[PDB]
Amino acid sequence: FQPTYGVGYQPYRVVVLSFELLHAPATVCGPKKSTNLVKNKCVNFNFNG
């Protein structure tokens, strides 16, 4: 890689984030916080997305 060359020849750093999107307990999460849990009432919910 030479610093003079046109952009398509210039180096790009690449990362591929690849998701283990399994129905198995999540080790990784977003910034979102939990509420407290509630039972035996009609509610909207989210578990791990």
Partner 1 sequence: AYTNSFTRGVYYPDKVFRSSVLHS
Judged by the rule CB under 8 A, the positions of this chain that interact with partner 1 are 22-24
| CA–CA separation, 26 and 22 (whole Å) | 8
Residue carrying structure tokens 């791990």: 48
**Residue with Cβ nearer partner 1 (27 or 35):** 27
Residue 24 CB, nearest approach to partner 1 (Å): 5
Dihedral (Cα; 3, 6, 10, 16), 10-degree rounding: 150
Residue 49 CB, nearest approach to partner 1 (Å): 16
Residue 22 CB, nearest approach to partner 1 (Å): 6
